[PDB]
Amino acid sequence: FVEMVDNLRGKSGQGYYVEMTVGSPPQTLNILVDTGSSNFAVGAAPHPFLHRYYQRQLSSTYRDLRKGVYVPYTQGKWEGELGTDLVSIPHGPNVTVRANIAAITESDKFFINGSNWEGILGLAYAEIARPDDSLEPFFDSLVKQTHVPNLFSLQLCGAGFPLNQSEVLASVGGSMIIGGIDHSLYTGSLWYTPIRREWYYEVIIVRVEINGQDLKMDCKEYNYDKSIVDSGTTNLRLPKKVFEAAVKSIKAASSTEKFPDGFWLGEQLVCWQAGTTPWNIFPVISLYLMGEVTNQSFRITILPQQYLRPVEDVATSQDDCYKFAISQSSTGTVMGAVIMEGFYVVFDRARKRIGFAVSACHVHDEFRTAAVEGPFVTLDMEDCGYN
Amino acid sequence: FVEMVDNLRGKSGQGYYVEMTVGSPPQTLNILVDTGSSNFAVGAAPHPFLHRYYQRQLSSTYRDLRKGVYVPYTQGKWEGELGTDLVSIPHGPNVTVRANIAAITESDKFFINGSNWEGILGLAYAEIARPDDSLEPFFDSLVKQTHVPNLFSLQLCGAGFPLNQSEVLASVGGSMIIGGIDHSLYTGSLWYTPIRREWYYEVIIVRVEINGQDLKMDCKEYNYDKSIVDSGTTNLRLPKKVFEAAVKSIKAASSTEKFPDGFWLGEQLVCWQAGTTPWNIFPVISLYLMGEVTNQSFRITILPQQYLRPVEDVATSQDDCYKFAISQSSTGTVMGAVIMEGFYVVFDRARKRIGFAVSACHVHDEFRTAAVEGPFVTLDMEDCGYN
Ligand SMILES: CCCCN(C)C(=O)n1cc(C(=O)N[C@@H](Cc2cc(F)cc(F)c2)[C@H](O)CNCc2cccc(OC)c2)c2cc(C#N)ccc21
Ligand SMILES: CCCCN(C)C(=O)n1cc(C(=O)N[C@@H](Cc2cc(F)cc(F)c2)[C@H](O)CNCc2cccc(OC)c2)c2cc(C#N)ccc21
């Protein structure tokens, strides 16, 4: 799948995107890769943050569905007009599909200044598509209309340092392999967790450790009210009780240095002299996931290099600065972009499972790397799912 | 070396011993394996703790050197009479050696009741032999007089739980492979550190971590005034400054549970309800050792299953009880039996180096294992040696 390697650009703070074309003749647009939703939508009218948009009147293959659509996400939202058009992915499979497209005409806190993307590719399942589940998501259309196998995999590559507008445009941000798995993108074994239900990419977390120390919560707390894999969100997002426990434990592990409350609240940066970030004082975080074999689990392990997101200094000094990329969630557990940066993630829709392997592009140091390890004989895993 | 596999009995608290014979006809004696000294010495007169002893008058091959010897160890000591006699190792190489033997006639806090050993085999170099370096140590005699290669290796096997008197007598305590390496005794790769000077088996520690967190001391502190590998001592022993930092850090890492000071002083037991020992709250300890390649180091990682030593619960309960097997040292760093239990240790005298590999009999849990890992780029490491 060499043609699809390195087809992504962007970063965790603003999103990872793929180049797509819509319409006839092709209109090129940059599209956010979002495993956390199921609508394919593009800017279709001028916006202060868009440098280009979808022009339906210029596409001869545009079909009007005569229907409005409203999509509220947790914080941002948009409103649009539904239609269909021919769609291609220049650095994807050699195919053209007719897919539903929501032409965005109004939005609030959706588009991101300087992100270089003009649309969103919702890669999850029909159940969470708006207006309802009859609006067939793009990936479903792709599989139905082509011979592309029913799976995709994602390698999101964090740089480990801040990127300005110029750098981010010229830097490779990762890979989206549509229809397969590319072996150059990972090391070690792929470990698979079942997709609990095909709506979001929902998984079940059975155990959490901070530097090997068990948080020792009822596992239902880890999945309350769901746990999802979401490339459309920056942070590891954790339910209230889990967040508080995790933060207390991370603070205690790293207590040789003190940080303001605002840092732990995800709001303010901390800076260190160039090169002197004390990675070793911060713990690793292991999430144990339900295995495919009964009574088995595996674990994925992330470093502070994942959960501390590089940010530019307010000064823009030689210092190395970061934000705490773990937040309290109103929506259950979310494995956002900063988690996904540690791993090659395989969305095996065909076998209703998600694969994890250590990413060939994850940021680490000489002393520690991200890990995917198993098996473990685990307690009563099904019970960890919330109802 | 199949004949020598499983030729050890014992445990960390009382010593690991090998069967030997001395004199003509052969007198069978159990002998403590001690890499921390250089005198071969045996009980030679009745003692409350000895069920048998060396009877020089009954040996036709006994030679009386007409000279006294006094050996003070840190806490224990003995005096005796020097001589030579023929020595063999029934479950060792098929050879007979004429070796120096100190016939112990008086002792204080040396013999251990119930240990089942009657003598000591000092396997270190002539430099620390008493009365002086002219008294050829046993291993030197063995190599000089036979075709046995100048190398031995040790696998000390801790049970991970208490053994009673009959249990320790009927259990395999490990292997002393004289003249070679047995591949069934380890997993992974052997990593070698240089022997700094041929007296004690002296090594250089270049970095110490507690759960990945750097103790952040000048590396000379870890080797002040020396660091040795010592099977004749139970604990990991650390110079005052290193000990204080380590205990602080281990208390910090295990802080969710509080223990009396006397536990941390290695004096008192801590007990938990049967099977409930909270291994996960205790940190791993990594000792980085100087590599053979310039600017290269490797690390050995021990678990709490190594540094918490199982001791019997003498009360009516079924508790699992332990002592803290890390002590403050007046004599530099000592890698005692509890450390060695984690690893297969190769005393490669011929190449002036010590090999470490994960032991096939180390105690662990399903979440963590002991490790031997490298390489790490490390600088100015000869600077870590004390002068
Ligand atoms: C890599 C993204 C760049 C940075 N941004 C904008 C973000 O970190 N975030 C993206 C979120 C979000 O809500 N993401 C959308 C996509 C999105 C990306 C973006 F770019 C700007 C947006 F409007 C939205 C996912 O799809 C959510 N999945 C669950 C869900 C929640 C609610 C409705 C859903 O289905 C329609 C799905 C989001 C939510 C919270 C909360 N609470 C905090 C930060 C968030
Ligand atoms: C196999 C462990 C059984 C339990 N015991 C008795 C011990 O834990 N220990 C053994 C020690 C000790 O001093 N060991 C001797 C051997 C020994 C074993 C035994 F069985 C009873 C003993 F008399 C002695 C080594 O040889 C020391 N190497 C450096 C050195 C220090 C001073 C002089 C030296 O060369 C002569 C060497 C020792 C020292 C301290 C101190 N400080 C604390 C505990 C110690």
Swiss-Prot record, chains A, B:
Q: Where is the active site?
A: 34, 230
Question: What are the subcellular locations of this protein?
Answer: Cell membrane; Golgi apparatus, trans-Golgi network; Endoplasmic reticulum; Endosome
Which intervals hold domain Peptidase A1? 16-357
- Enzyme class, one word? hydrolase
Q: How does it sit in the membrane?
A: Single-pass type I membrane protein
Q: Which GO terms describe its cellular component?
A: axon; cell surface; dendrite; early endosome; endoplasmic reticulum lumen; endosome; endosome membrane; Golgi apparatus
User: What is this protein's tissue specificity according to the annotation?
Assistant: Expressed at high levels in the brain and pancreas. In the brain, expression is highest in the substantia nigra, locus coruleus and medulla oblongata.
Q: Provide the family line.
A: Belongs to the peptidase A1 family.
Mind listing the UniProt keywords for this protein, alphabetically?
Answer: Acetylation, Aspartyl protease, Cell membrane, Cell projection, Cytoplasmic vesicle, Disulfide bond, Endoplasmic reticulum, Endosome, Glycoprotein, Golgi apparatus, Hydrolase, Isopeptide bond, Lipoprotein, Lysosome, Membrane, Palmitate, Phosphoprotein, Protease, Signal, Transmembrane, Transmembrane helix, Ubl conjugation, Zymogen
- Assembly state and interactors? Monomer. Interacts with RTN1; RTN2; RTN3 and RTN4; the interaction leads to inhibition of amyloid precursor protein processing. Interacts with SNX6. Interacts with PCSK9. Interacts with NAT8 and NAT8B. Interacts with BIN1. Interacts (via extracellular domain) with ADAM10 (via extracellular domain). Interacts with SORL1; this interaction may affect binding with APP and hence reduce APP cleavage. Interacts with NRDC AND NRG1.
Give me the reactions it catalyses.
Answer: Broad endopeptidase specificity. Cleaves Glu-Val-Asn-Leu-|-Asp-Ala-Glu-Phe in the Swedish variant of Alzheimer's amyloid precursor protein
Q: Which residues are exposed on the Extracellular face of the membrane? A: 1-387
Q: Which residues are glycosylated?
A: 94, 113, 164, 295
* Residues bearing PTM N6-acetyllysine: 67, 216, 220, 226, 240-241, 248
Induction pattern: Up-regulated by the Ca(2+)-regulated transcription factor NFATC4.
User: What does the record say about activity regulation?
Assistant: Inhibited by RTN3 and RTN4.
Q: Name one GO biological process term.
A: positive regulation of neuron apoptotic process
Q: Which residues form a coiled coil?
A: none
Write the protein's name: Beta-secretase 1
| Enzyme Commission no | 3.4.23.46
